[PDB]
Short mmCIF file of C-alpha atoms (C1' of nucleotides) in Angstrom, two decimals:
data_model
loop_
_atom_site.label_atom_id
_atom_site.label_comp_id
_atom_site.label_asym_id
_atom_site.label_seq_id
_atom_site.Cartn_x
_atom_site.Cartn_y
_atom_site.Cartn_z
CA UNK A 204 34.40 22.78 30.12
CA UNK A 205 31.60 23.51 27.44
CA UNK A 206 32.75 19.50 25.81
CA UNK A 207 32.42 18.42 29.63
CA UNK A 208 29.11 19.80 30.54
CA UNK A 209 27.76 18.37 26.95
CA UNK A 210 28.89 15.21 28.19
CA UNK A 211 27.17 15.31 31.49
CA UNK A 212 24.16 16.68 29.83
CA UNK A 213 24.38 13.44 27.37
CA UNK A 214 24.78 10.41 30.00
CA UNK A 215 22.21 12.90 32.41
CA UNK A 216 19.46 12.18 29.73
CA UNK A 217 20.72 8.46 28.61
CA UNK A 218 20.10 7.80 33.13
CA UNK A 219 16.57 9.33 32.56
CA UNK A 220 15.53 7.77 29.30
CA UNK A 221 17.57 4.17 30.53
CA UNK A 222 15.79 4.86 34.05
CA UNK A 223 12.01 5.42 32.07
CA UNK A 224 12.77 2.11 30.35
CA UNK A 225 13.58 0.46 33.77
CA UNK A 226 10.36 2.13 35.06
CA UNK A 227 8.33 0.39 31.98
CA UNK A 228 9.81 -2.87 32.41
CA UNK A 229 8.33 -2.69 35.86
CA UNK A 230 5.34 -1.78 34.73
CA UNK A 231 4.86 -4.41 31.77
CA UNK A 232 5.88 -7.12 34.16
CA UNK A 233 3.71 -5.66 36.94
CA UNK A 234 0.84 -6.26 34.02
CA UNK A 235 1.73 -9.55 32.46
CA UNK A 236 2.10 -10.80 36.50
CA UNK A 237 -1.16 -9.27 37.70
CA UNK A 238 -3.51 -7.66 35.57
CA UNK A 239 -2.79 -10.42 32.68
CA UNK A 240 -4.79 -12.96 35.06
CA UNK A 241 -7.16 -10.64 36.00
CA UNK A 242 -8.43 -9.82 32.18
CA UNK A 243 -8.47 -12.98 31.43
CA UNK A 244 -10.90 -14.07 34.22
CA UNK A 245 -12.74 -11.64 33.21
CA UNK A 246 -12.96 -12.33 29.62
CA UNK A 247 -13.81 -15.94 30.24
CA UNK A 248 -16.97 -14.91 32.82
CA UNK A 249 -17.66 -12.33 30.36
CA UNK A 250 -18.95 -12.54 26.31
CA UNK A 251 -18.88 -9.74 23.63
CA UNK A 252 -21.74 -10.84 21.38
CA UNK A 264 -22.62 -6.71 2.15
CA UNK A 265 -23.08 -5.53 -1.51
CA UNK A 266 -18.84 -4.87 -2.06
CA UNK A 267 -17.87 -8.42 -0.69
CA UNK A 268 -20.63 -9.49 -2.84
CA UNK A 269 -18.99 -7.90 -5.25
CA UNK A 270 -15.35 -8.89 -4.71
CA UNK A 271 -16.32 -12.03 -3.99
CA UNK A 272 -18.00 -12.50 -7.53
CA UNK A 273 -14.56 -10.69 -9.04
CA UNK A 274 -12.36 -12.59 -7.72
CA UNK A 275 -14.62 -16.25 -8.61
CA UNK A 276 -14.46 -14.31 -12.37
CA UNK A 277 -10.54 -13.72 -11.94
CA UNK A 278 -10.40 -17.31 -10.63
CA UNK A 279 -12.33 -18.15 -13.18
CA UNK A 280 -11.10 -16.69 -16.68
CA UNK A 281 -7.92 -13.85 -17.29
CA UNK A 282 -6.56 -11.88 -19.81
CA UNK A 283 -3.59 -9.52 -18.96
CA UNK A 284 -0.73 -7.95 -20.77
CA UNK A 285 1.83 -6.21 -18.36
CA UNK A 286 3.57 -4.64 -21.65
CA UNK A 287 5.77 -2.20 -20.54
CA UNK A 288 6.10 1.61 -22.26
CA UNK A 289 8.24 1.57 -25.86
CA UNK A 290 11.15 3.45 -25.44
CA UNK A 291 13.32 5.02 -28.01
CA UNK A 292 14.76 3.68 -31.40
CA UNK A 293 17.91 5.77 -31.06
CA UNK A 294 18.12 5.31 -27.12
CA UNK A 295 17.84 0.82 -28.40
CA UNK A 296 20.67 2.04 -30.64
CA UNK A 297 22.64 3.85 -28.23
CA UNK A 298 22.27 0.92 -25.35
CA UNK A 299 23.38 -1.69 -28.17
CA UNK A 300 26.13 0.36 -29.22
CA UNK A 301 26.72 0.78 -25.68
CA UNK A 302 26.93 -3.63 -25.31
CA UNK A 303 28.94 -3.90 -28.32
CA UNK A 304 31.71 -1.36 -26.84
CA UNK A 305 31.93 -3.13 -23.62
CA UNK A 306 32.27 -6.70 -24.96
CA UNK A 307 34.82 -5.88 -27.69
CA UNK A 308 36.67 -4.07 -24.49
CA UNK A 309 36.38 -7.47 -22.83
CA UNK A 310 37.33 -8.90 -25.63
CA UNK A 311 40.54 -6.92 -26.38
CA UNK A 312 40.87 -7.41 -21.85
CA UNK A 313 41.03 -10.87 -23.11
CA UNK A 314 44.08 -10.58 -25.33
CA UNK A 315 45.25 -9.21 -23.05
CA UNK A 316 45.95 -11.72 -20.75
CA UNK B 205 -20.50 -2.73 32.76
CA UNK B 206 -17.19 -3.88 32.98
CA UNK B 207 -15.88 -5.61 36.20
CA UNK B 208 -13.81 -3.30 37.85
CA UNK B 209 -10.73 -5.76 37.94
CA UNK B 210 -11.57 -6.31 34.12
CA UNK B 211 -10.92 -1.97 33.71
CA UNK B 212 -7.99 -2.06 35.51
CA UNK B 213 -6.25 -4.37 33.82
CA UNK B 214 -7.23 -2.44 30.47
CA UNK B 215 -6.44 0.48 31.29
CA UNK B 216 -2.66 -1.40 32.69
CA UNK B 217 -2.47 -3.15 29.79
CA UNK B 218 -3.56 0.38 27.47
CA UNK B 219 -0.67 1.82 29.03
CA UNK B 220 1.79 -0.42 29.07
CA UNK B 221 1.18 -0.45 25.19
CA UNK B 222 0.96 3.51 25.28
CA UNK B 223 4.31 3.72 27.11
CA UNK B 224 6.29 0.67 25.51
CA UNK B 225 7.64 1.28 22.08
CA UNK B 226 10.63 -1.79 22.17
CA UNK B 227 10.81 -4.97 24.36
CA UNK B 228 8.05 -7.38 24.81
CA UNK B 229 4.73 -6.94 25.50
CA UNK B 230 2.66 -7.96 28.17
CA UNK B 231 1.03 -11.31 29.56
CA UNK B 232 -2.21 -8.72 29.32
CA UNK B 233 -1.44 -8.87 25.50
CA UNK B 234 0.04 -11.91 25.25
CA UNK B 235 -3.30 -13.51 26.55
CA UNK B 236 -6.49 -10.96 25.03
CA UNK B 237 -6.02 -12.68 21.33
CA UNK B 238 -6.44 -15.32 23.43
CA UNK B 239 -9.86 -14.64 24.42
CA UNK B 240 -13.37 -14.13 22.66
CA UNK B 241 -14.40 -10.76 23.87
CA UNK B 242 -11.34 -9.19 21.21
CA UNK B 243 -13.22 -6.15 20.44
CA UNK B 244 -14.77 -5.42 23.88
CA UNK B 245 -10.65 -5.67 25.94
CA UNK B 246 -10.20 -3.49 23.11
CA UNK B 247 -12.66 -0.90 24.20
CA UNK B 248 -11.54 -1.24 27.55
CA UNK B 249 -8.30 -0.72 27.53
CA UNK B 250 -8.70 2.08 25.07
CA UNK B 251 -5.71 1.34 22.12
CA UNK B 252 -6.49 4.66 20.78
CA UNK B 253 -3.27 5.20 23.17
CA UNK B 254 -1.27 3.01 22.18
CA UNK B 255 2.39 3.81 20.57
CA UNK B 256 3.31 2.89 16.63
CA UNK B 257 5.65 0.31 17.34
CA UNK B 258 3.10 -0.89 19.91
CA UNK B 259 -0.04 -0.56 17.43
CA UNK B 260 1.85 -2.08 15.07
CA UNK B 261 3.19 -5.14 17.27
CA UNK B 262 -1.02 -5.85 18.54
CA UNK B 263 -1.39 -5.46 14.47
CA UNK B 264 0.71 -8.03 13.60
CA UNK B 265 -0.53 -10.44 16.31
CA UNK B 266 -4.52 -9.48 15.36
CA UNK B 267 -3.02 -10.70 11.79
CA UNK B 268 -1.48 -13.80 13.13
CA UNK B 269 -3.82 -15.17 15.63
CA UNK B 270 -7.17 -14.05 15.34
CA UNK B 271 -9.52 -15.05 12.82
CA UNK B 272 -11.06 -14.01 9.80
CA UNK B 273 -13.97 -10.88 10.98
CA UNK B 274 -13.01 -10.44 14.60
CA UNK B 275 -9.32 -9.38 13.08
CA UNK B 276 -10.93 -7.96 10.33
CA UNK B 277 -13.54 -5.82 12.04
CA UNK B 278 -10.50 -4.63 14.74
CA UNK B 279 -7.83 -4.35 12.33
CA UNK B 280 -10.59 -1.98 10.59
CA UNK B 281 -11.29 0.06 13.16
CA UNK B 282 -8.05 0.56 14.62
CA UNK B 283 -6.00 0.91 11.26
CA UNK B 284 -9.01 3.29 10.24
CA UNK B 285 -8.89 5.53 13.58
CA UNK B 286 -4.62 5.76 13.22
CA UNK B 287 -4.41 6.39 9.74
CA UNK B 288 -7.04 9.48 10.66
CA UNK B 289 -5.04 10.24 14.04
CA UNK B 290 -1.71 10.06 12.13
CA UNK B 291 -3.10 12.08 9.42
CA UNK B 292 -3.97 15.10 11.06
CA UNK B 293 -1.16 14.83 13.49
CA UNK B 294 1.57 15.29 10.85
CA UNK B 295 1.57 18.95 8.73
CA UNK B 296 2.87 17.00 5.61
CA UNK B 297 0.09 14.36 5.94
CA UNK B 298 3.27 11.65 6.77
CA UNK B 299 2.98 8.30 8.14
CA UNK B 300 5.37 5.92 10.63
CA UNK B 301 7.39 3.07 9.94
CA UNK B 302 5.70 0.96 12.36
CA UNK B 303 2.20 2.64 11.02
CA UNK B 304 3.75 0.97 7.46
CA UNK B 305 4.50 -1.98 8.49
CA UNK B 306 1.27 -2.26 10.25
CA UNK B 307 -0.64 -1.51 7.35
CA UNK B 308 1.84 -3.66 5.05
CA UNK B 309 0.73 -6.30 7.81
CA UNK B 310 -3.47 -5.66 7.36
CA UNK B 311 -2.62 -5.99 3.05
CA UNK B 312 -1.03 -8.92 3.86
CA UNK B 313 -4.37 -10.12 5.41
CA UNK B 314 -6.85 -10.38 2.40
CA UNK B 315 -10.09 -9.75 3.92
CA UNK B 316 -8.91 -7.18 6.21
CA UNK B 317 -7.23 -5.70 3.81
CA UNK B 318 -9.73 -4.97 0.76
CA UNK B 319 -13.15 -5.52 2.67
CA UNK B 320 -12.42 -4.40 6.07
CA UNK B 321 -9.52 -1.84 5.92
CA UNK B 322 -9.35 -0.82 2.39
CA UNK B 323 -13.50 -0.47 2.12
CA UNK B 324 -13.33 1.69 4.95
CA UNK B 325 -10.92 4.06 4.48
CA UNK B 326 -12.37 4.60 0.33
CA UNK B 327 -15.72 4.67 2.11
CA UNK B 328 -14.40 7.00 4.62
CA UNK B 329 -13.27 9.44 1.46
CA UNK B 330 -9.39 9.63 2.30
CA UNK B 331 -7.89 12.61 1.17
CA UNK B 332 -6.21 13.15 -2.07
CA UNK B 333 -2.52 13.22 0.25
CA UNK B 334 -3.82 9.87 1.88
CA UNK B 335 -4.88 8.29 -1.89
CA UNK B 336 -1.17 8.63 -2.65
CA UNK B 337 0.50 7.24 0.46
CA UNK B 338 -2.40 4.60 0.15
CA UNK B 339 -1.10 3.66 -3.85
CA UNK B 340 2.41 4.20 -2.95
CA UNK B 341 2.32 1.58 -0.31
CA UNK B 342 -0.08 -0.42 -2.34
CA UNK B 343 2.83 -0.86 -5.19
CA UNK B 344 5.39 -0.69 -2.79
CA UNK B 345 3.86 -4.28 -0.88
CA UNK B 346 0.79 -5.75 -3.69
CA UNK B 347 -1.36 -8.13 -2.36
CA UNK B 348 -2.32 -11.57 -3.68
CA UNK B 349 -3.48 -11.32 -7.37
CA UNK B 350 -7.50 -12.08 -6.42
CA UNK B 351 -7.36 -9.61 -3.90
CA UNK B 352 -6.12 -6.71 -6.07
CA UNK B 353 -8.71 -7.62 -8.79
CA UNK B 354 -11.22 -7.91 -6.22
CA UNK B 355 -10.32 -3.98 -5.28
CA UNK B 356 -9.88 -3.09 -8.65
CA UNK B 357 -13.69 -4.23 -9.46
CA UNK B 358 -14.87 -2.71 -6.55
CA UNK B 359 -13.16 0.76 -6.88
CA UNK B 360 -14.67 0.21 -10.62
CA UNK B 361 -17.35 -0.02 -9.84
CA UNK B 362 -17.84 2.59 -6.35
CA UNK B 363 -18.36 5.98 -8.38
CA UNK B 364 -15.55 8.32 -9.72
CA UNK B 365 -13.62 9.63 -6.58
CA UNK B 366 -10.04 10.47 -5.19
CA UNK B 367 -9.44 7.65 -3.65
CA UNK B 368 -11.25 5.69 -5.90
CA UNK B 369 -9.10 6.51 -8.52
CA UNK B 370 -6.00 7.02 -6.78
CA UNK B 371 -6.85 2.92 -6.06
CA UNK B 372 -7.35 2.26 -9.77
CA UNK B 373 -4.70 3.98 -10.84
CA UNK B 374 -2.37 2.01 -7.78
CA UNK B 375 -3.88 -0.87 -9.66
CA UNK B 376 -3.06 -0.66 -12.68
CA UNK B 377 0.89 0.06 -11.67
CA UNK B 378 0.79 -2.92 -10.04
CA UNK B 379 -0.64 -4.94 -13.38
CA UNK B 380 -2.56 -7.95 -11.54
CA UNK B 381 -4.34 -10.34 -13.13
CA UNK B 382 -7.56 -8.51 -15.00
CA UNK B 383 -10.42 -11.64 -15.36
CA UNK B 384 -13.13 -10.86 -18.31
CA UNK B 385 -15.17 -8.99 -15.17
CA UNK B 386 -12.49 -7.19 -14.47
CA UNK B 387 -11.74 -5.77 -17.77
CA UNK B 388 -15.42 -5.44 -18.50
CA UNK B 389 -15.89 -3.83 -14.70
CA UNK B 390 -12.67 -1.06 -15.76
CA UNK B 391 -14.28 -0.74 -19.09
CA UNK B 392 -17.54 0.57 -16.92
CA UNK B 393 -15.37 2.91 -14.91
CA UNK B 394 -13.89 4.50 -17.92
CA UNK B 395 -17.13 5.05 -19.75
CA UNK B 396 -18.29 6.18 -16.44
CA UNK B 397 -16.30 8.74 -16.11
CA UNK B 398 -16.79 9.17 -20.25
CA UNK B 399 -20.38 12.04 -21.23
CA UNK B 400 -23.21 10.82 -22.63
CA UNK B 401 -24.95 12.71 -25.49
CA UNK B 403 -30.33 11.54 -23.15
CA UNK B 404 -29.97 11.93 -20.08
CA UNK B 405 -26.36 13.21 -18.42
CA UNK B 406 -23.95 12.63 -15.41
CA UNK B 407 -22.24 15.14 -13.55
CA UNK B 408 -19.33 12.30 -13.41
CA UNK B 409 -20.00 11.92 -17.55
CA UNK B 410 -19.30 15.49 -18.22
CA UNK B 411 -17.16 16.50 -15.36
CA UNK B 412 -13.42 16.56 -15.88
CA UNK B 413 -10.97 13.79 -14.93
CA UNK B 414 -7.90 14.68 -13.08
CA UNK B 415 -3.28 13.83 -13.74
CA UNK B 416 -4.18 11.31 -11.50
CA UNK B 417 -6.62 9.75 -13.69
CA UNK B 418 -5.34 10.40 -16.82
CA UNK B 419 -1.63 8.56 -15.88
CA UNK B 420 -4.29 5.81 -15.25
CA UNK B 421 -5.55 5.83 -17.78
CA UNK B 422 -2.52 5.98 -19.93
CA UNK B 423 -1.52 2.47 -18.29
CA UNK B 424 -4.46 0.80 -18.32
CA UNK B 425 -4.39 1.85 -22.05
CA UNK B 426 -0.55 0.01 -22.39
CA UNK B 427 -1.32 -2.43 -20.32
CA UNK B 428 -4.75 -3.90 -20.70
CA UNK B 429 -6.11 -3.19 -23.74
CA UNK B 430 -6.07 -7.20 -24.44
CA UNK B 431 -8.25 -7.19 -21.98
CA UNK B 432 -10.39 -5.28 -23.61
CA UNK B 433 -12.21 -6.45 -27.07
CA UNK B 434 -12.74 -4.47 -30.29
CA UNK B 435 -16.07 -2.56 -28.88
CA UNK B 436 -14.32 -2.20 -25.24
CA UNK B 437 -11.00 -0.86 -27.52
CA UNK B 438 -13.62 1.18 -29.44
CA UNK B 439 -15.49 2.85 -26.47
CA UNK B 440 -12.06 3.18 -24.38
CA UNK B 441 -10.90 5.42 -27.72
CA UNK B 442 -14.26 7.18 -27.81
CA UNK B 443 -13.40 8.55 -24.31
CA UNK B 444 -10.35 9.42 -24.85
CA UNK B 445 -11.75 11.76 -28.09
CA UNK B 446 -14.46 12.66 -25.78
CA UNK B 447 -13.54 12.94 -22.12
CA UNK B 448 -9.13 12.71 -22.63
CA UNK B 449 -6.63 14.74 -22.54
CA UNK B 450 -3.75 16.00 -25.15
CA UNK B 451 -0.59 14.78 -23.98
CA UNK B 452 -2.06 11.31 -22.71
CA UNK B 453 -4.91 11.20 -24.12
CA UNK B 454 -3.13 10.76 -28.28
CA UNK B 455 -1.42 8.24 -26.22
CA UNK B 456 -4.78 6.61 -24.88
CA UNK B 457 -6.66 6.76 -28.05
CA UNK B 458 -3.88 4.94 -30.40
CA UNK B 459 -3.42 2.25 -27.59
CA UNK B 460 -7.00 1.64 -28.05
CA UNK B 461 -6.99 1.84 -31.92
CA UNK B 462 -4.32 -0.67 -31.73
CA UNK B 463 -4.66 -3.29 -28.94
CA UNK B 464 -5.24 -6.81 -28.35
CA UNK B 465 -9.33 -8.02 -27.89
CA UNK B 466 -9.84 -10.70 -25.98
"C1'" A C 1 -2.80 -26.28 1.39
"C1'" U C 2 -0.65 -19.44 1.91
"C1'" U C 3 4.33 -21.50 -0.53
"C1'" U C 4 8.00 -23.44 -4.14
"C1'" G C 5 11.63 -24.06 -9.64
"C1'" U C 6 12.15 -20.86 -13.08
"C1'" G C 7 12.21 -15.59 -14.97
"C1'" G C 8 12.02 -10.28 -13.49
"C1'" G C 9 11.41 -4.99 -12.29
"C1'" U C 10 13.97 -1.71 -8.70
"C1'" G C 11 15.80 3.83 -6.10
"C1'" G C 12 13.81 8.33 -4.13
"C1'" U C 13 7.05 8.71 2.47
"C1'" G C 14 14.58 13.01 -1.23
"C1'" G C 15 17.06 18.06 -0.54
"C1'" U C 16 16.31 22.13 -4.43
"C1'" G C 17 16.66 28.27 -5.39
"C1'" C C 18 12.44 31.00 -7.99
"C1'" A C 19 8.32 32.66 -10.12
"C1'" U C 20 3.45 32.08 -8.95
#
RNA sequence: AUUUGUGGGUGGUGGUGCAU
């Protein structure tokens, strides 16, 4: 009975969500039908009419003219690099053994 | 005073946007961008009540269709208001997925982001959490190199603060193109952070934060060559005077051994 | 006039005890 009531409550809430979605869609359709034209006509009949910017423009011009970049990553440990090389060598040796096997 | 029909249509469009996060936008919204009074239409519709997905869709439409200055101003205003509202609403100062999508669209818009939105957020003084979130979003979606260099230079020219420092840290993580003037701006910001022993300064004698220390470490790792011998020595002096212990040594070493432009 | 051929980075809008 509890699971049946759970299914019933979930279905009721889903139906409520679907009804809300349908109402929202109907409202949006009514808006697109009438308020769209009303707002278009009203906007046609109506009207609606720097230091940082200069610094940014100067910086952009300088970046276009000249550049000096070195995206160098952080240096890793020599022991870590040697271990990685050893692992790569082990993988290569295993691949060679597998190739020899078939 | 807007007409009665204009007010009714704008209110209907605003309510449709508020109650709609999925589906199709109204023809009112589809035709509002086709007019010149976009700001007036937005003000009449009260777009501050819209939903996050609707706001993201509107921002994308403004970026794709509207012009440079009009969409730039509209994006600046709407994005600043929405960011403040979302930061206030979220207890942990978190954003929504649609908000992040709209932010990515605004960042792709070069004029509306640095001049319109990033300038607005920095000028309004976004908090530390907001600055960190902005740095994460920028590292996720870096903008064009010219805009990135311009924003980095603007942040360097602006005084040292939480938002400018976090923007500088994000730019250092991105590792964009640094011109001669960009490297000069970075060195000027470093000098402004560093102390001077006739007229002293608050930002000169102040202590830098961990975000600033990490930004300085990344800058020393990356843009050593953009700094000449004099700028490298200046960075070494900054690491000695107003530097750190765990990050200050690497900063001094990179400033001493870095290439010159 | 933003995009391509070629390289290339790539997990935490993480959970997380505990002390403060």
